[PDB]
Amino acid sequence: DYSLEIDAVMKAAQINDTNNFVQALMRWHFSKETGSPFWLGMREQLNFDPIKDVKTINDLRQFSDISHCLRQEPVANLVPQGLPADSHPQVYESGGTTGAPKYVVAYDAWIEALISWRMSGYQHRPGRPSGNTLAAIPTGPHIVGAINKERALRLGGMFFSIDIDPRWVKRSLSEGDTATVRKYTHHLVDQVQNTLMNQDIRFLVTTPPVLRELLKRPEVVLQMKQSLAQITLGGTELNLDEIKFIASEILPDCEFSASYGSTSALGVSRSLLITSESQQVIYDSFSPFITYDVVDSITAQTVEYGERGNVIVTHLSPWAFYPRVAERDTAIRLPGVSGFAGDRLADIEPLK
Amino acid sequence: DYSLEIDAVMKAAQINDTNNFVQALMRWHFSKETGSPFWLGMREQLNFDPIKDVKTINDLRQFSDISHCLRQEPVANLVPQGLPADSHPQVYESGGTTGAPKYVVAYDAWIEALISWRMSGYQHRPGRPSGNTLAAIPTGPHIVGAINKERALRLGGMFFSIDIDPRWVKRSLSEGDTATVRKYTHHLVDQVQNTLMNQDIRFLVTTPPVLRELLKRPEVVLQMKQSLAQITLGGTELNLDEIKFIASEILPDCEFSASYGSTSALGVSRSLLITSESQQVIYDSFSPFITYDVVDSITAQTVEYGERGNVIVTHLSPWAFYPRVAERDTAIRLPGVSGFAGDRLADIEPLK
Ligand SMILES: O=C(O)c1cccc2nc3c(C(=O)O)cccc3nc12
Numbered sequence: 001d002y003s004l005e006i007d008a009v010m011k012a013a014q015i016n017d018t019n020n021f022v023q024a025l026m027r028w029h030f031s032k033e034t035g036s037p038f039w040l041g042m043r044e045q046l047n048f049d050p051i052k053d054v055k056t057i058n059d060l061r062q063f064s065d066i067s068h069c070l071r072q073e074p075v076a077n078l079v080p081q082g083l084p085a086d087s088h089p090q091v092y093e094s095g096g097t098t099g100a101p102k103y104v105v106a107y108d109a110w111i112e113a114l115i116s117w118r119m120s121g122y123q124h125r126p127g128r129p130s131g132n133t134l135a136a137i138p139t140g141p142h143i144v145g146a147i148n149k150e151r152a153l154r155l156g157g158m159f160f161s162i163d164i165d166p167r168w169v170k171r172s173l174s175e176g177d178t179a180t181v182r183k184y185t186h187h188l189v190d191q192v193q194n195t196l197m198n199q200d201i202r203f204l205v206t207t208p209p210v211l212r213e214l215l216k217r218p219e220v221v222l223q224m225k226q227s228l229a230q231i232t233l234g235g236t237e238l239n240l241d242e243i244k245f246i247a248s249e250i251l252p253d254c255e256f257s258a259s260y261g262s263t264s265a266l267g268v269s270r271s272l273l274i275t276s277e278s279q280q281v282i283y284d285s286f287s288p289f290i291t292y293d294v295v296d297s298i299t300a301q302t303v304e305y306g307e308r309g310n311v312i313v314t315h316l317s318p319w320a321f322y323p324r325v326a327e328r329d330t331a332i333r334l335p336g337v338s339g340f341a342g343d344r345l346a347d348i349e350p351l352k
Numbered sequence: 353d354y355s356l357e358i359d360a361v362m363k364a365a366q367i368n369d370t371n372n373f374v375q376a377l378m379r380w381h382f383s384k385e386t387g388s389p390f391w392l393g394m395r396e397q398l399n400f401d402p403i404k405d406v407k408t409i410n411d412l413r414q415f416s417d418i419s420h421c422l423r424q425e426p427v428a429n430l431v432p433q434g435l436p437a438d439s440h441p442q443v444y445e446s447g448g449t450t451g452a453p454k455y456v457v458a459y460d461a462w463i464e465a466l467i468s469w470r471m472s473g474y475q476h477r478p479g480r481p482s483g484n485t486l487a488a489i490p491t492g493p494h495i496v497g498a499i500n501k502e503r504a505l506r507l508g509g510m511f512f513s514i515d516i517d518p519r520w521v522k523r524s525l526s527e528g529d530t531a532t533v534r535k536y537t538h539h540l541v542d543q544v545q546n547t548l549m550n551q552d553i554r555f556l557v558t559t560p561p562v563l564r565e566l567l568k569r570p571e572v573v574l575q576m577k578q579s580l581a582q583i584t585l586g587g588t589e590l591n592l593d594e595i596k597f598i599a600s601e602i603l604p605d606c607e608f609s610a611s612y613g614s615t616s617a618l619g620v621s622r623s624l625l626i627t628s629e630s631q632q633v634i635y636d637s638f639s640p641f642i643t644y645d646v647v648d649s650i651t652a653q654t655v656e657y658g659e660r661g662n663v664i665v666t667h668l669s670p671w672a673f674y675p676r677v678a679e680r681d682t683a684i685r686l687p688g689v690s691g692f693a694g695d696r697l698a699d700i701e702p703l704k
């Protein structure tokens with residue numbers, strides 16, 4: 001048993017101090033008894049002592065991104081030896097859309113915690129809406145699946161999804177294939193159309209192209225006017241005006257937000273409500289578990305508030321440690337309202 | 353709370369008192385405080401009284417298939433109120449066949465009972481192999497996914513899958529889009545490869561066409577001789593010598609079995625291990641919960657043992673009640689293990 005060690009971390013985690021939390025988990029991960037086999041096996045390859053010289057969140061700047069590894073590393077070793085017997089491990093992959101695919105492990109406690117964080121703020125808000133959720137997103141080996149199912153149960157209906165293979169979509173628009181992308185996009189909208197038109201759907205998770213498509217279908221729009229309380233847009237292909245126009249002129253009773261995948265850190269980040277009065281899309285991460293740095297593409301250097309840079313993300317929780325993953329997007333750096341740790345993002349945009 | 357009603361139904365199953373079990377569930381499903389809104393309402397369209405006029409399994413012949421009907425029915429109404437608060441309804445579909453589809457509801461406790469029935473005989477027996485599962489099958493809204501996930505957690509390793517979008521294969525297939533069925537399969541095969549190579553998996557779930565393009569790869573085949581222990585093949589494209597050959601010749605000691613989805617009975621029947629003895633693939637179902645009848649296409653009369661007929665599957669449990677689904681496959685009918693209600697099936701093929 002180590003569950004009272006573990007509480008201490010989750011405790012430190014919100015009495016807002018980076019510091020103590022970082023050290024506590026640096027200990028969790030590298031100390032002999034409790035650590036991952038993987039990190040324990042990695043300690044001797046580091047040129048610094050993860051205990052002695054490593055105090056601030058920022059102080060993790062000294063690990064490099066170990067994703068190369070996770071393609072080969074047999075998943076059983078990723079699992080912190082000090083988690084309970086019934087922790088309930090699970091493998092998720094990170095888009096083997098070419099350069100193919102990186103293995104990771106997550107846990108129910110973890111996803112539960114992610115979600116309570118996303119949803120605080122409206123979980124308990126009087127007259128908050130209720131109903132099923134249609135999530136038009138990957139499930140299968142993709143950890144968004146499992147994160148979305150979890151939200152859907154807390155909103156009082158059932159979680160519904162579609163058949164979607166993002167890996168073929170990709171390997172085909174990259175592969176240059178025009179007709180396919182249209183035909184498969186079709187088949188996606190058709191699936192979403194059916195469920196919206198045959199079960200009462202209160203909550204839709206989808207993406208601008210797909211929404212954009214549904215809005216072009218007279219019967220569906222009408223139906224959306226009747227039943228959607230809130231839509232989440234995922235991707236980075238987001239045009240703020242378009243959304244303002246939808247929100248005010250078409251689905252005026254439906255709120256909007258955006259979601260940002262950071263598969264690398266075993267989670268997703270959430271936007272504020274995007275309204276007509278909104279002037280950028282703004283994101284927060286589940287800090288300190290997940291934290292963003294935003295850095296210059298030339299000099300690896302955290303850039304100033306207000307400027308564009310490259311998203312660097314870091315997961316540090318009792319379940320998993322992933323320092324300092326370069327994500328493949330740029331964002332405006334903004335002071336992160338609480339702590340105490342990690343940055344806000346605004347207006348995420350793709351790379352080169 | 354109704355733990356004692358469920359207990360009785362379970363216990364009448366576990367000692368095969370088929371009439372008790374059926375009579376109990378008619379009460380359970382048809383009565384104002386325990387049953388699903390759907391059945392309660394559906395009663396006013398029947399012309400017999402489930403509670404009084406139904407005494408044995410055959411007696412359900414009085415019911416008609418109520419499937420084409422679960423496209424628009426509200427999912428929440430499928431849920432028997434007699435189930436507990438905590439029972440975790442989750443929503444699954446089938447019949448993305450042409451474009452439909454039919455929503456149903458499943459529960460952890462059912463999924464669990466099912467798997468337990470699938471897995472006795474081996475679960476415990478000495479020396480039973482054990483490790484990771486790779487399941488080349490759909491997740492998303494396909495109960496099949498959920499099913500295997502369960503199984504994999506009981507074989508001491510984790511659950512790997514792949515993106516795979518069976519409606520696409522299907523539509524394409526029956527478009528004549530012959531071009532990209534073959535492209536797509538390559539994609540599935542590739543994704544399988546990867547995991548086969550990068551994580552050691554003990555058990556694979558797939559299908560004859562894919563395993564076919566798969567054994568065209570010499571180094572996957574070496575990995576396979578090395579790591580696989582058990583292979584479950586589903587779909588109904590089962591070619592028998594083709595397997596017996598594969599198992600005898602190509603990879604000579606992985607064991608091989610078949611699996612058959614009756615998705616609108618919320619479950620999968622299992623075959624007897626295909627030995628090199630095997631003269632027909634034979635499936636057991638999870639009786640009395642799931643029971644099969646095999647019926648002549650003109651008279652709906654139950655065929656003699658050994659004639660091939662059109663298959664009818666029925667699901668009756670404390671979780672759901674789907675009487676008499678016209679599935680879309682023929683089989684040779686066999687005696688089921690006497691004591692148990694329902695036929696054994698052999699050498700299933702599809703319709704025309
Ligand atoms: O999911 C998000 O990223 C998200 C972001 C911002 C506000 C949100 N408000 C929600 C409400 C509500 O405000 O009643 C109900 C259900 C889901 C909601 N999701 C929200």
Ligand SMILES: O=C(O)c1cccc2nc3c(C(=O)O)cccc3nc12
Nearest residue numbers: 474480481582584609622623624625
């Ligand atoms: O999965 C199936 O459909 C199946 C059917 C028949 C025999 C099976 N035997 C298995 C064994 C074993 O016999 O040791 C181990 C792991 C999985 C097994 N799966 C089997």
